[PDB]
Amino acid sequence: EAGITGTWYNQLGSTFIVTAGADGALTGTYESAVGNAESRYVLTGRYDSAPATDGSGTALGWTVAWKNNYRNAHSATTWSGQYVGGAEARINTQWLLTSGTTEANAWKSTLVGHDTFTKVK
Amino acid sequence: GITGTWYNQLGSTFIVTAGADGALTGTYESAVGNAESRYVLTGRYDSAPATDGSGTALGWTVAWKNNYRNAHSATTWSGQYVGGAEARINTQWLLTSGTTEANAWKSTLVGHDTFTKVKP
Amino acid sequence: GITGTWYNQLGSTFIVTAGADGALTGTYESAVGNAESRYVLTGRYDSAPATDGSGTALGWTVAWKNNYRNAHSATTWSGQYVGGAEARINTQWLLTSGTTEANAWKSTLVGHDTFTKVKP
Amino acid sequence: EAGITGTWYNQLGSTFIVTAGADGALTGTYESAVGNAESRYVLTGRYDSAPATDGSGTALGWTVAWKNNYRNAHSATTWSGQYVGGAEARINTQWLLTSGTTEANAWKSTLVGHDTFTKVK
Numbered sequence: 001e002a003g004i005t006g007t008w009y010n011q012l013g014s015t016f017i018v019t020a021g022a023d024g025a026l027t028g029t030y031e032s033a034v035g036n037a038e039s040r041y042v043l044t045g046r047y048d049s050a051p052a053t054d055g056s057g058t059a060l061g062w063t064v065a066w067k068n069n070y071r072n073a074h075s076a077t078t079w080s081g082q083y084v085g086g087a088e089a090r091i092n093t094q095w096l097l098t099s100g101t102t103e104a105n106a107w108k109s110t111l112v113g114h115d116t117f118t119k120v121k
Numbered sequence: 122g123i124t125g126t127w128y129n130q131l132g133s134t135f136i137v138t139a140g141a142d143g144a145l146t147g148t149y150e151s152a153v154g155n156a157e158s159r160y161v162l163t164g165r166y167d168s169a170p171a172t173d174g175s176g177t178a179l180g181w182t183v184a185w186k187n188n189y190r191n192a193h194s195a196t197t198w199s200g201q202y203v204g205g206a207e208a209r210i211n212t213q214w215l216l217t218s219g220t221t222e223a224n225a226w227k228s229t230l231v232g233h234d235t236f237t238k239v240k241p
Numbered sequence: 242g243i244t245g246t247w248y249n250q251l252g253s254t255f256i257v258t259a260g261a262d263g264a265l266t267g268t269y270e271s272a273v274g275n276a277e278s279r280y281v282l283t284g285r286y287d288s289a290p291a292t293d294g295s296g297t298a299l300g301w302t303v304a305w306k307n308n309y310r311n312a313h314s315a316t317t318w319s320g321q322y323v324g325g326a327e328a329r330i331n332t333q334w335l336l337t338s339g340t341t342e343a344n345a346w347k348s349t350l351v352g353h354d355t356f357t358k359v360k361p
Numbered sequence: 362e363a364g365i366t367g368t369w370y371n372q373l374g375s376t377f378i379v380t381a382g383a384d385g386a387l388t389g390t391y392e393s394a395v396g397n398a399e400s401r402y403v404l405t406g407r408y409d410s411a412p413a414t415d416g417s418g419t420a421l422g423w424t425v426a427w428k429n430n431y432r433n434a435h436s437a438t439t440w441s442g443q444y445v446g447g448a449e450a451r452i453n454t455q456w457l458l459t460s461g462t463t464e465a466n467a468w469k470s471t472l473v474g475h476d477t478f479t480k481v482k
């Protein structure tokens with residue numbers, strides 16, 4: 001939690017700014033270096049606020065709908081993964097990016113990938 | 122609309138409110154897994170979808186900790202709402218468990234849930 | 242058994258032979274996408290599944306090149322066969338397109354196909 | 362193809378030995394450093410045997426059913442990804458590992474991950 005809260009960057013050059021609340025909330029903004037995106041987007045999510053203390057990561061996830069006051073891609077990404085704490089903090093994720101499609105095109109609505117986030121300071 | 126009480130093919134209950142500007146807020150009760158009672162969820166959806174017949178993109182997260190249990194895991198659902206007479210939310214999901222780094226390869230389950238407002 | 246002609250929810254046709262020791266060999270004809278006619282597939286399945294009621298794990302690949310078209314892409318389906326009166330193959334799939342390194346983030350689609358032997 | 366053919370290792374320490382045939386076939390063996398696995402397992406797959414020449418990767422995929430003459434995990438993995446050629450050849454993949462389950466447990470049948478393979482020589 002104080003762990004998770006901060007600024008993070010992934011391998012694409014994207015920026016994630018997040019605050020982890022005592023109640024398990026994640027709130028912040030996401031800026032993507034790629035895709036049909038510009039500026040910052042709201043994110044919201046959840047994390048395990050009482051994780052195991054036995055060397056395990058802390059499970060978390062968040063969503064961005066790719067609409068802000070400047071652009072709308074008619075799509076949303078969710079990241080699912082875990083925070084790994086300590087001096088070299090990482091958030092390791094897999095994600096699903098679903099675009100709104102017609103029914104005929106639903107088979108090709110969803111991209112899958114993986115992002116690694118590095119905490120800055 | 123998206124706001125309402127939804128059920129998937131497993132009999133899980135997804136109760137959500139869609140805020141006017143894109144928020145999803147609600148509770149999730151899973152019929153399966155290391156879960157009992159309701160869990161907090163939050164997410165986002167496209168609050169100005171295309172007007173060509175396309176569905177409404179969305180996603181949400183549950184961390185599987187509540188007053189009864191903690192599974193040390195979180196699921197995200199990514200999908201789209203399809204309105205009409207038999208409204209549906211079609212999703213794919215990622216369930217990540219906290220693991221050691223070495224077991225990270227087996228940390229994440231993937232699946233697909235379809236939701237309707239029809240009570241089992 | 243697994244050997245036979247299968248159809249998914251999109252109306253794609255999956256014609257396969259399950260070899261006694263685990264091979265899957267056949268053809269795939271997709272009803273959607275950058276595809277026409279039949280494509281070669283190969284895969285593997287568990288040729289000695291558990292006897293507790295569990296399904297039979299399997300997977301296969303199609304590279305979307307044939308004599309008619311080349312989409313510069315490949316799909317893998319990972320899933321399990323569930324026998325019984327209404328045999329089913331339930332899958333999740335990954336469709337990777339060749340991309341530049343920089344566009345690799347958007348190289349891979351994911352979805353789910355369910356197959357039965359019922360002709361549309 | 363001469364590209365793809367060879368020995369590869371991923372970040373877990375697993376070994377993939379493959380031959381790419383002129384007809385788009387992939388054949389070989391896989392040895393996993395992790396999981397319910399020992400020794401070598403057959404793999405088979407397919408690749409785009411006439412890829413684009415415009416800087417793009419070569420699409421491919423393969424499957425392992427985790428039964429060999431020493432062990433059976435009642436599971437199968439498929440890797441989907443692309444080969445990136447040149448002096449520092451890589452195969453970048455995402456994978457799906459489905460275990461056989463009862464119907465009641467099908468929701469938890471499938472793991473998802475990503476592997477990066479480095480060609481040795």
Ligand SMILES: O=C(O)CCCC[C@@H]1SC[C@@H]2NC(=O)N[C@@H]21
Binds near residue numbers: 035
């Ligand atoms: O193109 C869109 O539909 C909106 C932008 C999507 C950007 C994706 S989300 C997954 C991946 N990680 C990033 O930081 N950016 C891309």
Ligand SMILES: O=C(O)CCCC[C@@H]1SC[C@@H]2NC(=O)N[C@@H]21
Binds near residue numbers: 131151156195
């Ligand atoms: O077992 C856990 O770690 C927590 C409960 C997970 C339940 C999963 S979330 C995806 C799927 N859809 C449901 O409604 N339930 C399962």
Ligand SMILES: O=C(O)CCCC[C@@H]1SC[C@@H]2NC(=O)N[C@@H]21
Binds near residue numbers: 273274276305
């Ligand atoms: O468009 C392409 O790149 C090639 C055709 C892809 C068809 C996909 S494979 C997954 C899904 N299931 C089908 O039967 N068809 C689509």
Ligand SMILES: O=C(O)CCCC[C@@H]1SC[C@@H]2NC(=O)N[C@@H]21
Binds near residue numbers: 373398
């Ligand atoms: O545990 C099993 O069911 C069989 C072994 C699975 C090993 C997996 S396949 C994906 C990942 N990549 C590897 O090299 N090993 C693991």
